Amino acid sequence: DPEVTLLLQCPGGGLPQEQIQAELSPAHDRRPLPGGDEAITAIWETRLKAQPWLFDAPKFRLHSATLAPIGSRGPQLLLRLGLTSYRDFLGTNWSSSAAWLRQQGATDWGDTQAYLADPLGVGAALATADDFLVFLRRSRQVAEAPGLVDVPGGHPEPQDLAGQLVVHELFSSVLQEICDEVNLPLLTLSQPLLLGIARNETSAGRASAEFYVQCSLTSEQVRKHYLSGGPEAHESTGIFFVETQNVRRLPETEMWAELCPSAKGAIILYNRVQGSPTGAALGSPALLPPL
Numbered sequence: 001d002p003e004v005t006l007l008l009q010c011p012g013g014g015l016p017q018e019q020i021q022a023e024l025s026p027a028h029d030r031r032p033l034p035g036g037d038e039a040i041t042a043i044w045e046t047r048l049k050a051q052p053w054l055f056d057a058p059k060f061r062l063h064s065a066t067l068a069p070i071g072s073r074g075p076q077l078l079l080r081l082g083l084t085s086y087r088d089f090l091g092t093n094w095s096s097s098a099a100w101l102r103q104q105g106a107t108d109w110g111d112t113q114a115y116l117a118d119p120l121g122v123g124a125a126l127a128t129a130d131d132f133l134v135f136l137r138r139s140r141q142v143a144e145a146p147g148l149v150d151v152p153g154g155h156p157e158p159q160d161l162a163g164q165l166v167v168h169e170l171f172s173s174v175l176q177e178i179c180d181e182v183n184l185p186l187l188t189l190s191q192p193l194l195l196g197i198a199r200n201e202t203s204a205g206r207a208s209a210e211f212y213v214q215c216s217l218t219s220e221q222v223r224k225h226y227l228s229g230g231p232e233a234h235e236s237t238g239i240f241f242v243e244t245q246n247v248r249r250l251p252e253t254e255m256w257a258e259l260c261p262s263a264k265g266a267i268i269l270y271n272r273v274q275g276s277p278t279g280a281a282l283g284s285p286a287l288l289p290p291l
């Protein structure tokens with residue numbers, strides 16, 4: 001799977017909000033382009049003169065994420081974050097020249113991402129009360145990953161002593177994205193656990209935080225809530241469900257070739273962090289079938 005790389009695998013089955021610190025700093029921002037940020041401005045102008053209803057929005061930038069020594073007390077993860085924008089994304093990661101920017105960042109800064117917007121995404125492995133994960137089909141008419149399978153998520157817009165408010169907005173945003181797109185009541189959702197961070201090598205290495213969320217409704221009830229919104233209540237064109245039993249071998253199925261990179265990251269991290277039992281009971285052959 002060359003289109004997805006794991007940047008972080010969380011310990012202990014995944015991390016709750018109270019165990020994560022963020023450092024939001026202009027030291028974590030994109031570096032100005034070698035020939036100047038006028039190249040980004042020019043791409044944006046061209047785009048607005050064809051689609052004048054488009055708007056810019058601020059986004060979080062991932063610089064890096066450092067895990068504490070395993071088994072330790074106190075905060076377990078430090079997220080180093082900057083600020084970027086949808087406009088900066090369109091002029092860097094989305095650019096035809098994105099590979100040239102990665103090579104220049106290696107040369108100039110010893111950092112393939114130094115000249116990339118790298119907006120932070122969020123995604124969920126969302127499990128039902130009857131033990132299915134939730135999948136969504138993308139429109140065949142959108143610019144990114146048309147017609148592919150996705151999981152719930154999005155790219156949060158901003159608004160440890162401003163750090164804890166930033167971690168809160170990240171955890172809040174994955175629940176909000178489930179309520180907005182799947183049309184589930186907020187009171188049917190667990191507090192999220194962070195599973196890890198995955199990079200999309202098809203979009204020049206931009207990263208998504210991947211979470212586990214449990215719903216108290218069954219697959220049939222989740223379907224009813226999604227469909228009862230009508231075609232205008234969701235950006236996706238369909239919902240479907242796979243038994244957690246069968247997620248284990250998804251990379252061996254014909255579905256795998258249809259998953260967008262950030263959804264592949266969510267399923268790999270679900271399989272490594274929530275699946276793959278460590279103890280004698282769940283690791284017994286009748287409960288963990290060989291092969």
Ligand SMILES: CNC(=O)c1cc(Cl)ccn1
Pocket residue numbers: 059085086089119144155
């Ligand atoms: C229309 N696309 C988006 O809203 C989007 C925004 C960002 Cl920041 C990254 C990828 N896609």
